[PDB]
């Protein structure tokens, strides 16, 4: 079973995550979101809402024997938490024009000492997601590695949404290797083209889950491994208060 | 006392040879010497501290 300097807890409001097999928290770019006000806004921000700075936990998908290498699932931020599952975060988010935040994630998946396989979990700024910024529905190897080009663009070399997955480890990441761990912990600071974001039309960060070494096991072993995640906005700062977005969807 | 021996000369054989060796045992036991000689096989590298370390699991 799981041990000692590998047993770890993280308290967020009224939220706390525990793992008995961690490998540490990878802090991307080596910095955390400071929670500082955007220098481009004259209005004072609403910040430090306790009800907002906690972990939102929901399920991603199911890992099976069938997934092939590099098939993935994307979770666009802040969008995934802008709805009902986003609690007061979502509610506040829908009434502000702009949000500036960092992310702290934990993705979870257990198997046994008789299972073999590994996931790659990474977080990437400006990763190409669905149009509508929603979590992918099923695993896909869609539009890797040359991007999506137009129908007719018969001879085009590639499109700007290219993604050479052979290099996905350039992104802040950690491996969820079944023989080693059960959880992966990442944290990223705020990065964007501007001092704060009009989140409505931009999913600036994407949490990506990909298979790199396919699931293997002998008969009688657990057969499908669920994948869940805990996401927490790190010191979000809101500005430009107005009426509700509404069609939140 | 002594027996029937009355030679002037020092015994040619030393005592540990001429006689048995009277020993005395103490009630509470006695500790063996620490070592019976210097013959030994040695175990090295038993422990740690120092390598291509702390890349090494917790």
A151 touches chain B (CB under 8 A): no
Q: Under 8 Å CB-to-CB from A225, ≥6 apart: which residues?
A: A62, A63, A64, A109, A110, A111, A115, A215
Can you give the residue ranges of every domain in chain B? 1-58
Domains of chain A: residue spans and CATH:
1-249 (2.60.120.20)
CA distance A190 to A236: 10
Q: Where are the alpha helices (DSSP H) in chain A?
A: 87-94
CA distance A82 to A79: 5
Nearest chain A residue (CA) to B58: A5
B58 touches chain A (CB under 8 A): yes
Q: Provide the experimental method for this PDB entry.
A: X-ray
Largest Cα–Cα separation, chain B: 83
Long-range CB contacts for residues A155-160, cutoff 8 Å, separation at least 24: none
E strand or H helix at B15: helix B15-18
Three-state secondary structure call for residue B37: coil
In this structure, the number of other CB atoms found within 10 A of the CB of residue A156 comes to 11
> CATH classification of B1-58 is 4.10.90.10, yes or no?
yes
CA distance A188 to A201: 20
What residues of chain A lie within 8 A of the CB of B54, using their CB? none
Q: Is residue A143 within 8 Å of A161, Cβ to Cβ?
A: yes
B56 touches chain A (CB under 8 A): no
Check the CA dihedral A65-A66-A72-A77 and report its sign.
Answer: negative
What residues of chain B lie within 8 A of the CB of A8, using their CB? none
Q: Under 8 Å CB-to-CB from B48, ≥6 apart: which residues?
A: none
Final resolution, Å: 3.0
CA distance A240 to A198: 10
- Confirm whether residue B38 is marked as ligand binding: no
Give the single-character DSSP code of A160.
T
B27 touches chain A (CB under 8 A): no
CA distance A87 to A81: 8
Nearest chain B residue (CA) to A180: B57
CA distance A92 to A50: 12
Q: Under 8 Å CB-to-CB from A83, ≥6 apart: which residues?
A: A90, A248, A249
């Amino acid at each position: 079973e799981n041990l000692s300097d590998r047993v770890s807890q993280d308290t967020a409001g009224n939220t706390v995550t525990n793992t008995q097999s961690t490998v540490g928290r990878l802090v991307g770019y080596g910095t955390v979101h400071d929670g500082e006000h955007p220098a481009s806004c004259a209005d004072t921000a609403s910040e430090k809402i306790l009800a907002v700075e906690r972990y939102y936990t929901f399920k991603v998908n199911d890992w099976t024997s069938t997934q092939k290498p590099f098939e993935y699932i994307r979770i666009p931020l802040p969008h995934v938490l802008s709805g009902e599952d986003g609690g007061v975060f979502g509610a506040t988010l829908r009434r502000h024009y702009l949000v500036k935040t960092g992310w702290r994630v934990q993705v979870q998946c257990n198997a046994s000492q008789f299972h073999a396989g590994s996931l790659l979990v990474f977080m990437a700024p400006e990763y190409p997601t669905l149009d509508v910024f929603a979590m992918d529905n099923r695993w896909s190897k869609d539009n890797l590695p040359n991007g999506t080009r137009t129908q007719t663009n018969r001879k085009g070399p590639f499109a700007m949404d290219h993604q050479n997955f052979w290099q996905w480890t350039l992104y802040p990441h950690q491996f969820l290797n079944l023989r080693t761990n059960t959880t992966v912990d990442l944290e990223v600071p705020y990065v964007n083209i501007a001092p704060t974001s009009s989140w409505t039309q931009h999913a600036s960060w994407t949490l990506v889950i990909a298979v790199v070494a396919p699931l293997t096991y002998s008969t009688g072993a657990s057969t499908s491994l669920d994948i869940t995640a805990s996401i927490q906005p790190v010191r979000p700062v809101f500005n430009g208060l107005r009426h509700e977005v509404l069609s939140r969807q | 006392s002594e027996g029937n021996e009355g030679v002037i000369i020092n015994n040619f054989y030393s005592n540990q040879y001429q006689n048995s060796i009277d020993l005395s045992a103490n009630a509470t036991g006695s500790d063996p010497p620490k070592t019976y000689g210097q013959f030994s096989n040695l175990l090295s590298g038993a422990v740690n501290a120092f390598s291509n370390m702390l890349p090494l699991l917790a």
